[model samples]
Target: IRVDTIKNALTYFDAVRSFKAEFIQISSTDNIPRYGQVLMRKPGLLKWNYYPPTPVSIIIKGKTISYYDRELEEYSYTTINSPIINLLSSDMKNISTIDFVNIDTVNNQKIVTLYDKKSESQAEVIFNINPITIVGLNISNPDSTTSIQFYNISSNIPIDKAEFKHDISHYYSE
Candidate 1:
């Protein structure tokens, strides 16, 4: 679909404050890449067991973001306003505010390429919009290098405030 069409479909975000989905997240640097998945229920709870091999999960509970590594003996915590946190909470309006370098269409999908106006790196987000579903998403980065596919998405799920609470007894350590 065209960029404008994709953009229009993305407006669904305003009405969706919470959702549940299976998310595959990949991150890479100049020399390394990592891929993982978390069955996400937002406002936040991530049932990481949904994805085996890499069972680590990151969750935002209250003002803190906690990283639970099944391979490690401990959970590391950070503030919710971290850069990565900001990216995860990002909406189209937030993304559009950045310095966009290009918008290209290939194979019926629109790719919105942007540069982090305040940072040194750049990102190319490709959105495949399902015209009927009104789901416009970028499952992969440029070059199809790293991709995250979100499926079984349902918004406005019944999320209780207690869901974001950190319960150490719920996970194993060591």
Candidate 2:
């Protein structure tokens, strides 16, 4: 049944410890395509680095979320309000209220809708069933829809925590 399929996908998502991927992001507001790299480590660490033409990075170290704009030479501190944050950080201990809204099959792919009551977040995770790999994520926001397609999904690989460095002296804690 569809319930079984969705359960399996949810289980797979919960099992991820770490992953790195190159992603293509498309925003509906501008309809502009952006290139970025996503590096995620379990429990708390996640970093998103945007390539040139964008030149920005969003780094999350524990509860501190920082956004750095390279070209503009500015650093802005923000909260974990990203859909990616909700998807990646919602693990077993806080499995939360997850509703498997719908599942669709197209061209041998499974598109699953995941809703998190804790964060009030929703995302469509596209999967390739053969090995149960996550291929893409689409997050619908109030003003814009962001679609991200990932390539070269390397998971369970060693990630150096040193690579996530950012100066916090300029930032004051709440």
Candidate 3:
């Protein structure tokens, strides 16, 4: 059943200790998409390095999220509380507290919509079933829906800890 499929997907996601991928993010409000590389480690370690011309880096370590803008030489820190951030960095055990809105199988992909009760946020997670990998995410904002699709994904791979560290430190804090 649908519940069974969701459970299986959660189990698979829970087993992913590390992941790296190249991603493209598109928002409904803008036609221009953003390019980035994402790296993630279990227990709340994630980094998104944007390609040039954008000059942005978002890093999540432990409970703090660091957003840096290279062009502006500024950075800001905030605690991780977004539903999307939690979904990527936290364990599947946290899924129990979330509501599974629906599951749809389109072509070879399985899309699961999840609602975070505490944050009142909803997002759709797309999966590839062959190896049980997550390929994309769709997050809703007030005026736009942002869709992030990953390619050349490598999961459970040995990614060095240094990759998640901020390289251009000494920059101004925002």
Candidate 4:
């Protein structure tokens, strides 16, 4: 039942036309403050535009995820089986994992931990109750750790669909 709460909260967000938040990304070495936005239509395309004032975007359009670096002027991609997954799509169905942790709560907030069998990757996603939006996540890998915290969320609002696309041809010129 608790697991389903975590699942349904994420599923409910799939209806959001645009999900926007000001988030902080933290690591042992550095802390970054950024703006995050997502636009999606389920079982189809989803775009995540993350900006620390300038945008580095990831578009999951079809069977692939395209990571576009605006300053570096390069594009790298992976199939749906990509080792890393975004917090917005952190729903159970979208996750590939061998284990789901049962109940553990902090400050009345529920925690969902996913462990990947193939990679031994661990990601803990935390959620707030009642309204149940995502609060934060901690990711653990063999090499590094990352923490993401969302602030000032503007949920289910309308944003221009065009913000989702970045012209690849223009970036090659940079």
For residues 1-174, write the lDDT of model 1, one tens digit per residue.
Answer: 456644643453334456555555554433232343333343334443324465456665433667776656377878743222333345555555555446666787655555554543455444444532112333223344444455566655676655543334433564
Ranking by TM-score: 3, 2, 4, 1
Candidate 2: misplaced stretches above 4 Å? 1-6, 81-84, 98-101, 116-121, 166-174
lDDT of 4 by residue, 1-174 (tens): 956755654443443434566667777555555556655443345676776565588887555778888789788889756334543544345543444444367888877676666666677777776766666768888877888776786665665656557546554677
Off by over 4 Å in 1: 1-16, 26-50, 61-64, 80-84, 91-97, 101-110, 124-145, 165-174
Candidate 3, residues 97-135: lDDT per residue as tens digits?
A: 565556778999877788776666678888887687779
TM-score of 3: 0.85
How far in Å is the alpha carbon of 29 misplaced in model 2? 0.1
Q: Which of 2 and 4 is ahead in lDDT?
A: 2
Clashing pairs in 1: none
Give all candidates' CA lDDT scores.
Answer: 0.47, 0.73, 0.79, 0.62
Model 4: residues with Cα > 4 Å off, grouped in runs: 1-18, 29-46, 52-55, 80-87, 90-92, 96-98, 157-163, 167-174
List residue ranges in candidate 3 displaced over 4 A.
Answer: 1-6, 169-174
Clashes of 2: 0
Clash counts for all predictions: 0, 0, 1, 0
Measured by TM-score, how close is model 1 to the native structure?
A: 0.54
